[PDB]
């Protein structure tokens, strides 16, 4: 009676395929035709930001878009200054091996977590003085891969075991758990609204979720291998996906369905993050090749290039009011573009 | 101005002493030796802890140099995408436990560390384990896979273990020299392979791999000159 | 979406002779290495063969070195594999699995439980 349901799941898929296809009149690559393209895009290394040992695994910027907090597999969490270069607190943790870090929206928290499971948040302001960790929430099976605050009482985790979960910090249980993935979860994305949140897994398929119910909205498929990066567009209306096939993807959430392909026959290698800039326009993406590509999100032809890493670019973001772009890479820098 | 001076200048005492703890911190963290501590299901490693939560840690010192050992636990049977963690140790030790068939599945897992792009540069300390368990194999079962052992003469290059049947030697010498035949088709000279006999009671252990760490050291180090 | 489609089936008499083939669709199979996984009946999912994105290297487990052999069609986007002297311990599902990533030479695809770019399998009884 397996082989009943297989056959059944078969029918639905190809219905939601034709579905899909009917829905399609018209490519992304057809209204923005005659559109004018943004020239070259020229970014200069503004800061350089030195003081980590080991390879810097994960970067966070604040909302006041000044301070950033950075991770590295040395054991350490140290918060930037990013205007004076100033190193503002250095965290040493437990676990050497820490594959996140957040930082929360009121900038009163940190959390970081890695191999060890746990996700690790970290009081800053503390009357006392000393940054002290605050609360550990235990109950994943699979390394901690991502993590993102909602509040400064609500946390979502992705995990190698390949479920998310929302957490409650103060009480330290996990309120709701998002198991739909067969592959570990490599990265998560919340909406500007923080009703919803979209995440990407090693099964080459994404997923948007709804915090409150619990539940799987829509799943996106395209990509051919696995998905290390995910991002929102500024409107929280598509999500732009980085994976190791060498190509990113649009995916539009009301169409159901994927909008654009950013390739290019020599790159032939995969994406380690993925950012968009403030007004949606371009679409930056770091790559095994120690590079950054600046993406055309309306043509899918590429306008600059961020070199000056030395080894593998594993994060990235840009800042909240869109004025600066941070790059951290296994060389144990951290650059800020401009 | 007095409270932008004062501000900036707190600042800069603050990035000095954090600074200064980091420059204490360099120092512990450039003289220690991480190794990752890998199996498979049949291979024990725990006789190689006893004699020596999603990971492990373990503190050892030998001749005053500090080891750091750790050895993966509640992580899934999918290695690939926390195995770039461990880039960056100066060895991977990989115990094996020769004897479904899981030496297939060693040597398929050890074709996968060597051959991906982010492990090329680290060197792995193989650990042939359960030799003594080679002993009460008498039944004519390594024939069944592995067919090629037929046609197989022992090295006589290598010694073995003085009072040792040919059986045991043929068998572990043809092991490890699939294991080479592995590590040898890189032609690289990038990262280095040691493999050794263990058992489940020994004491050189901690010896062996103290002395390949020197190794690896010595490597590297001739190869930043180019004289390797 | 990666899908991976086997045919092939029992029951063959001892000495026998059938011919396994997947059809792959969803990623560029030029791209890729391909192996075929085979799980018998109350064991694990041992790995069986495996073949490169030419078609140029080629790599056989112990017991069947010889007697099976593994072929793409990088046109017709296929997998072969023909099973000759076929043995009562030959029983399993056989599996067609992809490489996780492509121009790569390591694959940590034998996973006993949940691999995502691995077909459905298709019994084969000896």
């Known amino acids: 009676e397996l082989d009943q349901l297989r056959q059944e799941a078969e029918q639905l898929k190809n219905q939601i395929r034709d579905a899909r296809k009917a829905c399609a009149d018209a490519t992304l690559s057809q209204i923005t035709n005659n559109i004018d393209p943004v020239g070259r895009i020229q970014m200069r290394t503004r800061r350089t930001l030195r003081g980590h040992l080991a390879k810097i695994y994960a970067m966070h910027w604040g909302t006041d878009s000044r301070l950033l907090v950075s991770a590295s597999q040395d054991g350490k969490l140290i918060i930037w200054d990013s205007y004076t270069t100033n190193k503002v607190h250095a965290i040493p943790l437990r676990s050497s091996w820490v594959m996140t870090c957040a930082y929360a929206p009121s900038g009163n928290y940190v959390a970081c977590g890695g191999l060890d499971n746990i996700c690790s948040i970290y009081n800053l302001k503390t009357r006392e003085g000393n940054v002290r960790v605050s609360r550990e929430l235990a109950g994943h099976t699979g390394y901690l891969s991502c993590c993102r605050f909602l509040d400064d009482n609500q946390i979502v985790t992705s995990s190698g075991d390949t479920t998310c979960a929302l957490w409650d910090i103060e009480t330290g249980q996990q309120t709701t758990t998002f198991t739909g993935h067969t592959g570990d979860v490599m990265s998560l994305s919340l909406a500007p609204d923080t009703r919803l949140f979209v995440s990407g897994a090693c099964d080459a398929s994404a997923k948007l979720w709804d915090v409150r119910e619990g539940m799987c909205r829509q799943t996106f498929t395209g990509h051919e291998s696995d998905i290390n990066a995910i991002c929102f567009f500024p409107n929280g209306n598509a999500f732009a996906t980085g994976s190791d096939d060498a190509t990113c993807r649009l995916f539009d959430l009301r169409a159901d369905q994927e909008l654009m392909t950013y390739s290019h026959d020599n790159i032939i290698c995969g994406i380690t993050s993925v950012s968009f800039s403030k007004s949606g326009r371009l679409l930056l993406a770091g790559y095994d090749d120690f590079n950054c590509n600046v993406w055309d999100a309306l043509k899918a032809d590429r306008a600059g290039v961020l070199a000056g890493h030395d080894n593998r670019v594993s994060c990235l973001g840009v800042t909240d009011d869109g004025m600066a772009v941070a790059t951290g890479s296994w060389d144990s820098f951290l650059k800020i573009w401009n | 101005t007095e409270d932008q001076r004062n501000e900036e200048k707190a600042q800069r005492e603050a990035n000095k002493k954090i600074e200064k703890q980091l420059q204490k911190d360099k120092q512990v963290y450039r003289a220690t030796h991480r190794l990752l501590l890998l199996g498979a299901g049949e291979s024990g490693k725990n006789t190689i802890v006893k004699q020596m939560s999603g990971i492990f840690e373990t503190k050892f010192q030998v001749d005053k140099v500090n080891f750091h050992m750790f050895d993966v636990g509640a992580q899934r049977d999918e290695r690939r995408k926390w195995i770039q963690c461990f880039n960056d140790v100066t060895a991977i030790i990989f115990v094996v436990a020769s004897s479904t068939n899981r030496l297939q599945a060693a040597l398929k897992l050890f074709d996968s560390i060597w051959n991906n792009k982010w492990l090329r540069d680290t060197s792995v300390i193989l650990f042939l384990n359960k030799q003594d368990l080679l002993a009460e194999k008498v039944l004519a079962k390594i024939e069944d896979y592995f067919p090629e052992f037929a046609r197989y003469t022992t090295p006589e290059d290598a010694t073995p273990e003085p009072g040792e049947d040919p059986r045991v030697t043929r068998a572990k010498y043809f092991i490890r020299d699939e294991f080479l035949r592995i590590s040898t088709a890189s032609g690289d000279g990038r990262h280095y392979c040691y493999p050794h006999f263990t058992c489940a009671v020994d004491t050189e252990n901690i010896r062996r791999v103290f002395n390949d760490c020197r190794d690896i050291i010595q490597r590297m180090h001739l190869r930043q000159y180019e004289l390797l | 979406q990666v899908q991976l489609q086997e045919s092939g089936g029992g029951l063959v008499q001892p000495g026998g002779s059938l011919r396994l083939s997947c059809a792959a669709s969803?990623?560029?199979?030029?791209?890729?290495?391909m192996n075929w996984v085979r799980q018998a009946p109350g064991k694990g999912l041992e790995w069986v063969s495996d073949?490169?994105?030419?078609?140029?290297?080629?790599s056989y487990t112990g017991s069947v070195k010889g007697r099976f052999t593994i072929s793409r069609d990088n046109a017709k986007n296929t997998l072969y594999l023909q099973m000759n002297s076929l043995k009562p311990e030959d029983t399993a599902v056989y599996y067609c699995?992809?490489?996780?990533?492509?121009?790569?030479?390591?694959?940590?695809?034998?996973?006993?439980?949940?691999?995502?770019?691995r077909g459905q399998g298709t019994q084969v009884t000896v």
């Open positions: 073949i490169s994105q030419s078609g140029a290297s080629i």
């Open positions: 969803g990623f560029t199979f030029s791209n890729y290495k």
């Open positions: 699995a992809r490489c996780p990533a492509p121009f790569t030479r390591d694959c940590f695809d034998v996973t006993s439980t949940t691999y995502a770019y």
